[PDB]
Design a protein around this ligand. Structure first.
Ligand SMILES: Oc1cc(F)ccc1CNc1ncccc1-c1ncccn1
Ligand SMILES: [Cl-]
Lengths: 251, 251
């Protein structure tokens, strides 16, 4: 009875929650530069995930304590009537660490809260982490950062999506926002509601990798290409088809 | 002329090379156990990749010099008349290392040889690595290894495929071979010639993650689940549709 075109069950009452931790400025003593244009990324994401049925919850420049509280809160609430869970980090990072305002947090400890045992209402549901994070360098300019965050996998039914891979560079425009996020959001607009999600992330790889870096205004920025990637532990096709809401309570 | 359904051009004269480095025994002083059943994996892969058009080239228990010579030989030959490239490692590993007979080799230097820069004939063509490699723990017995090899990316148009992710366990049967290779090879047999390759890898993720580990002949092997993963830096849909070989030279 085995089906090679098996899809994730996406006919629950509500889509689910999409967390966005949005980090613009950092504690003085971390010496990490401003991320001017992250707020465009946050707004763009907030719109595209809204249009796909997500309850979007944005958080700006949380300290480590505040951030762990808010995520663990979400991890221990019930997602029984939800299709999936999405968690976005827009910040700096190093290795297996994302930066809150004041200190680094081990990514595995954030993903671990949503692993089958610890969050039962999400077992066998897709759990999607999108990570725009690289290393701080130390009107619309393009600022460029060296890939620093490891392209980590997680557990069954996770999809880890990374702006940039080892040996490549993450770009952010100070008004329009991150290359990766612009292209993710553009692909969500056009094909979010129809395409399989990894089919879509593959378009984002193309879009981003095709952005030319030969005739940059800054000479140093030349030849600093950006290739994103995703690490999939998904077990089925993932679609975000419009939800049948006609005469239904979805709040 | 952006196309959401764009597929890698797979209409070259030949499919390409599939390298299989198969490692059963190791130099005494490494203190690594034999990998009984890796020869089933090597024969199963040889058959499935043959049946998809690949010129399959197997190498057994090469030392680091021999292995580097053979992979450098293949990387500087012309693949201009080829759709793609497949390289498989069946060995032990640690971090970003795979084990040859006598020493560990950095995986970045192997994947580095086929990067657009260094292997022009393969630029914009899929380069596919498959890695059955865990920590050597030390009739048909099921031996279980701890995940050890990093699920790292490898640059534009690379697909890195891993038997097991951080904090899960890799299984090998001494006669039937590795769970991951069995399930991969089953899905290649049935759907290799029709399905997009990442859809296929998603079926392998389901098949392996569903294998029960609750009533094992070893008590200590109980609860040691296996979740594979793949890191995709591909920019298009990858298909291995049968090639039209009627009155055509494909050698
Ligand atoms: O992916 C994994 C698989 C495992 F079995 C165990 C641990 C990890 C996570 N580590 C990494 N993953 C991807 C790229 C680099 C690293 C990396 N690089 C250096 C140090 C630590 N991690
Ligand atoms: Cl064929």
């Amino acid at each position: 009875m085995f089906d090679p075109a098996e899809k994730y069950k996406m006919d629950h009452r509500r889509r689910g929650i999409a967390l966005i931790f949005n980090h613009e400025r950092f504690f003085w003593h971390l010496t990490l530069p401003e991320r001017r244009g992250t707020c465009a990324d946050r707004d763009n994401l907030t719109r595209r995930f809204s249009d796909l049925g997500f309850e979007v919850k944005c958080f700006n420049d949380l300290k480590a304590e505040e951030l762990l509280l808010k995520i663990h809160e979400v991890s221990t609430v019930s997602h029984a009537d939800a299709d999936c869970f999405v968690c976005v980090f827009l910040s700096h990072g190093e290795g297996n660490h994302i930066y809150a305002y004041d200190a680094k947090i081990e990514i595995q400890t954030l993903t671990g809260l949503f692993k089958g045992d610890k969050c039962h209402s999400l077992v066998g549901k897709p759990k999607i982490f999108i990570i725009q994070a690289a290393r701080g360098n130390q009107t619309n300019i393009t600022e460029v950062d060296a890939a620093s965050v490891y392209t980590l996998p997680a557990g069954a039914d996770f999809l880890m999506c990374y702006s940039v891979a080892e040996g490549y560079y993450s770009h952010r425009e100070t008004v329009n926002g991150s290359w990766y996020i612009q292209d993710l959001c553009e692909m969500l607009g056009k094909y979010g509601s129809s395409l399989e999600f990894t089919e879509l992330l593959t378009l984002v790889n193309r879009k981003v990798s095709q952005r030319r870096v030969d005739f940059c205004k800054d000479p140093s920025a030349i030849g600093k290409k950006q290739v994103p990637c995703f690490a999939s532990m998904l077990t089925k096709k993932l679609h975000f088809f419009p939800k049948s809401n006609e005469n239904l309570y979805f709040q």
